[PDB]
Amino acid sequence: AQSVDQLIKARGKVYFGVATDQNRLTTGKNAAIIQADFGMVWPENSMQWDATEPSQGNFNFAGADYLVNWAQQNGKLIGGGCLVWHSFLPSWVSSITDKNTLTNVMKNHITTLMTRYKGKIRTWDVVGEAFNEDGSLRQTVFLNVIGEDYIPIAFQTARAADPNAKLYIMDYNLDSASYPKTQAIVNRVKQWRAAGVPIDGIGSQTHLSAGQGAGVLQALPLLASAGTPEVSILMLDVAGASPTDYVNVVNACLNVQSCVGITVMGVADPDSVRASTTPLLFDGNFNPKPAYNAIVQDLQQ
């Protein structure tokens, strides 16, 4: 019955957060659990590109406004994103072949979203899933048409739009220190920051299989060695939801001074994209699972 957000704040961290949206906040017991136990909300889908700019320059903020207003009324921090991500791109973006055209489209998308919520958003995921598994840059429309400079341009544009916000790059499969993607994002972020690119954090999109929590104890310090002000755990879920895996991720966060917090992918198992693996902290009756209680106990001691 204890609040993991309150307990992680008592241990000197900023938040324990969760992804949600209007559809969740009006069903189940999601709103009550988020009120009680989590200190930051992120939009599952309502700030992705296809949701917010389904036709060029025709923006739709209905869902994102709902979340932001709910968070403000309930005193929660807000994360937003992802601004530049190949996975949620409407077709009209993918079909652009001209460098100037796509650069202006990308800057306009970033600036429009960030200005609407200026000062209200703690963290923005600016660029997501930009690396291949071998550590090369993923050949998305942005890389193919703009080139490698698209990442610096995105971050420079974001910093100008809202200087209050923390600006993150985010990726998955950064859960092992020796994995090529982990090495590459650390090296590239070092280089970008040394050239003045305003990358404030690395967000690790942590989707674990059973037993993989132990590797995060080594991987997260390595991510923090890139020298960003902050790192975080983002969209966490764990197949099987073993307490051992979840406690290991929490302990990695506690061990890394620049790790500001942890965000889980959702509230309750039945609403997971991989529900058969029951990977979240609340079950289908909205009761806390053993892993939730284990995190509470770890943070209390």
Side-chain angles (χ1 to χ4, degrees):
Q2 294 287 111
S3 160
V4 289
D5 179 77
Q6 189 280 311
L7 290 170
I8 212 172
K9 283 171 159 66
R11 298 293 296 267
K13 301 300 192 179
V14 180
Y15 62 83
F16 211 121
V18 63
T20 193
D21 254 334
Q22 185 180 346
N23 66 323
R24 309 291 183 205
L25 289 168
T26 58
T27 58
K29 296 171 79 286
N30 299 299
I33 287 165
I34 293 171
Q35 289 171 332
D37 294 334
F38 294 100
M40 185 168 189
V41 295
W42 295 72
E44 299 177 330
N45 290 106
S46 66
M47 293 192 189
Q48 306 301 348
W49 196 313
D50 62 342
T52 53
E53 203 184 354
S55 296
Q56 184 176 345
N58 285 254
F59 286 82
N60 188 339
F61 296 109
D65 285 350
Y66 186 98
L67 182 67
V68 172
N69 292 334
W70 187 95
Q72 289 189 120
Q73 289 177 355
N74 286 276
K76 307 301 183 182
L77 298 167
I78 312 166
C82 182
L83 293 166
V84 184
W85 191 1
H86 69 289
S87 281
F88 290 91
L89 281 187
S91 305
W92 67 262
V93 180
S94 306
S95 67
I96 296 169
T97 58
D98 178 71
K99 179 169 174 163
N100 289 125
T101 302
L102 188 62
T103 301
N104 291 332
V105 157
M106 184 187 75
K107 293 178 71 175
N108 184 239
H109 185 84
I110 294 169
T111 300
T112 299
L113 266 67
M114 290 186 70
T115 296
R116 184 174 186 86
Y117 303 114
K118 187 177 179 184
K120 300 178 178 180
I121 307 304
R122 191 209 180 267
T123 301
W124 277 101
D125 287 331
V126 178
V127 173
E129 301 188 354
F131 289 84
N132 290 310
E133 299 311 303
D134 65 11
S136 59
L137 291 174
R138 186 188 290 280
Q139 293 166 322
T140 68
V141 64
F142 302 105
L143 188 74
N144 295 336
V145 171
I146 301 173
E148 297 187 23
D149 283 334
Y150 88 90
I151 288 173
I153 291 164
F155 278 95
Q156 294 160 0
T157 301
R159 177 69 100 231
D162 184 356
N164 179 250
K166 300 291 175 67
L167 307 183
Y168 279 50
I169 187 165
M170 156 275 264
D171 221 321
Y172 66 93
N173 278 349
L174 309 177
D175 311 305
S176 166
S178 61
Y179 197 66
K181 200 191 290 186
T182 311
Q183 300 280 313
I185 197 172
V186 167
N187 197 45
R188 296 308 290 268
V189 167
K190 286 186 190 169
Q191 292 175 339
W192 283 320
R193 285 184 46 82
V197 181
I199 302 176
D200 301 313
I202 298 166
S204 183
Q205 181 197 326
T206 301
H207 301 296
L208 300 181
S209 304
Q212 288 186 331
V216 180
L217 295 169
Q218 252 185 345
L220 193 65
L222 185 63
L223 290 177
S225 75
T228 57
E230 308 188 346
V231 301
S232 72
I233 300 296
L234 177 64
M235 300 323 161
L236 173 67
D237 63 358
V238 180
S242 171
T244 306
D245 285 310
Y246 266 111
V247 168
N248 267 336
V249 174
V250 169
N251 282 347
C253 166
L254 295 177
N255 288 338
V256 175
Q257 185 194 344
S258 62
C259 190
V260 294
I262 299 168
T263 299
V264 298
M265 187 71 244
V267 170
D269 286 335
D271 293 325
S272 173
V273 302
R274 55 170 173 179
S276 69
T277 72
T278 59
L280 298 177
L281 290 174
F282 293 84
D283 67 17
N285 296 320
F286 292 99
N287 284 328
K289 288 163 72 178
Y292 187 90
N293 294 328
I295 291 170
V296 167
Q297 195 274 325
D298 187 42
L299 291 170
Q300 287 174 330
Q301 289 280 342

